[PDB]
Amino acid sequence: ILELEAERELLNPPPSPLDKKFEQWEEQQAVEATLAAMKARRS
Amino acid sequence: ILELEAERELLNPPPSPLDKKFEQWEEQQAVEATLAAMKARRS
Amino acid sequence: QEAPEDLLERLLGEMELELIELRRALAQTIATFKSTERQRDAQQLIAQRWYEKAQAALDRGNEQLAREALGQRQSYQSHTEALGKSLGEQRALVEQVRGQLQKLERKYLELKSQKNLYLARLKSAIAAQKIEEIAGNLDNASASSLFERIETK
Amino acid sequence: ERKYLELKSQKNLYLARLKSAIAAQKIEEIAGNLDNASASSLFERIETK
Amino acid sequence: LLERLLGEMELELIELRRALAQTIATFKSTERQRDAQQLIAQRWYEKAQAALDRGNEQLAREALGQRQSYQSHTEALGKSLGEQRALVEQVRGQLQKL
């Protein structure tokens, strides 16, 4: 079972900590940015 | 797919920038010349 | 070898089969191309619903759900952003084939147009040879093939 | 599932592109028989007769 | 033999015509492949731009540093495309007189 999963990730770009950081950060920016529009609109 | 398109253009004269220029220019002259008759007729 | 002229009619006879088959194919292309647009529209509409629910979540101070709702929308946002760009680029995909086909028909009609003209010219000549070929039998005595041989008898 | 649907999604798009080309070659291939006398494959040979 | 020789001659010429297309098929194929690579570098370059924003220059170093791998790969392929242009020119010059 384990070898084939590794084969998949080998043929995959395993999301690096950078893209995990970027995707999390941009999500953290996306949630904040989406939040930022709402927090400003309500006033 | 790509080879056969090239075969067509090989057996074709691919419109050169000159004929593109001429056809565009004569069109630019045709539109202007057709326009020129109208712009003069209206007065 | 076979008379290549006869094949000409057969070739165009089978030609229309391809052209009509082509015409069928192109529609299926735009069928899906526009289908994704509707599918995109539903997805973004769902995101709007999630976005709207986040707006409702924000109301009354329940911002906690809005984070999930907005956070949930991010999944479809990326899916929406992914598909939206695919739709934009697929536009040129259908443009070239449209540009491919539009020139297609104008040629065949003119190609078929001159087909018949030269068939007449050929059939014009096959008569000229035969009337002259038979006129060889009915000649001015240069060959004496048929008539003059009788005059001998 | 999210992959297969998109995988199946683009499956049909390029089939059309392929079937688009198979027509382009054939119309041009037959247009070779009906040419501008560069090859004289079919029509010009008749003009000889 | 003269008639036979030209009869088999057209076989080579048409076989030639097929061959030349496969040449430009790849020649232009690398250009698209180059375009994707540089586009990826642009994405990495763009992500570095995003990394720079908000003061997270640390990722930009990796992102820009990551782009250097494709930059060299991009620079390598770009020059190959440029020189391959003359490769297809001579054969085109070869065939046109043919």
Numbering used by the authors:
A (entry chain 3), B (entry chain 2): 175 to 217
C (entry chain 0): 22 to 174
D (entry chain 1): 126 to 174
E (entry chain k): 28 to 125
Pull verbatim passages from the article behind this deposition:
The bacterial member PspA is part of the phage shock protein (psp) response that maintains structural integrity of membranes under stress conditions such as temperature and infection. The main effector of the Psp system is PspA, a 25 kDa protein consisting of six α-helices connected by short loops and an elongated hairpin, where the N-terminal helix α0 of the protein remains unfolded in the absence of membranes. Interestingly, PspA is related to eukaryotic and archaeal endosomal sorting complexes required for transport (ESCRT)-III proteins and has a similar structure. Here, we show that rods of bacterial ESCRT-III protein PspA internalize and thin membrane tubules by overcoming the required bending energy through progressive membrane binding of the N-terminal helix in the PspA assembly.
For our analyses, we refolded PspA in the presence of 50 nm sized small unilamellar EPL vesicles, similar to a recently described protocol. In the presence of EPL membranes, the rods had a wider diameter and a broader diameter distribution (200 to 345 Å) in comparison with the diameter values and distribution of the previously analyzed apo protein (180 to 290 Å). By segmenting the rods of the EPL-PspA sample and sorting the segments according to diameter through classification, we determined a total of 10 cryo-EM structures with resolutions ranging from 4.7 to 6.5 Å. While the imposed helical symmetry parameters suggested no architectural relationship between the PspA rods, helical lattice plots revealed that the left-handed helical rung corresponding to layer line ~110 Å in the power spectrum increased in Bessel order from n = 10, 11, 12…18 with increasing diameters of 200, 215, 235…345 Å, respectively. Upon insertion of an additional subunit into the helical rung, the assembly widens in discrete steps of around 20 Å up to a diameter of 345 Å. The rods with diameters larger than 280 Å were of particular interest as they showed enclosed double-layered lipid density in the cross-sectional top and side views in addition to the expected PspA protein densities, whereas rods of 270 Å diameter contained only partial lipid density and smaller diameters showed no density in the cross-section views. When comparing them with the previous apo structures, we observed that the structures of the EPL sample were identical to the apo structures with the same diameters, including their respective helical symmetry. The cryo-EM structures and MD simulations showed that only rods wider than 270 Å internalize and tubulate membranes. As indicated in the simulations, the energy required for membrane bending likely is too high for thinner rods to bend and internalize membrane tubules.
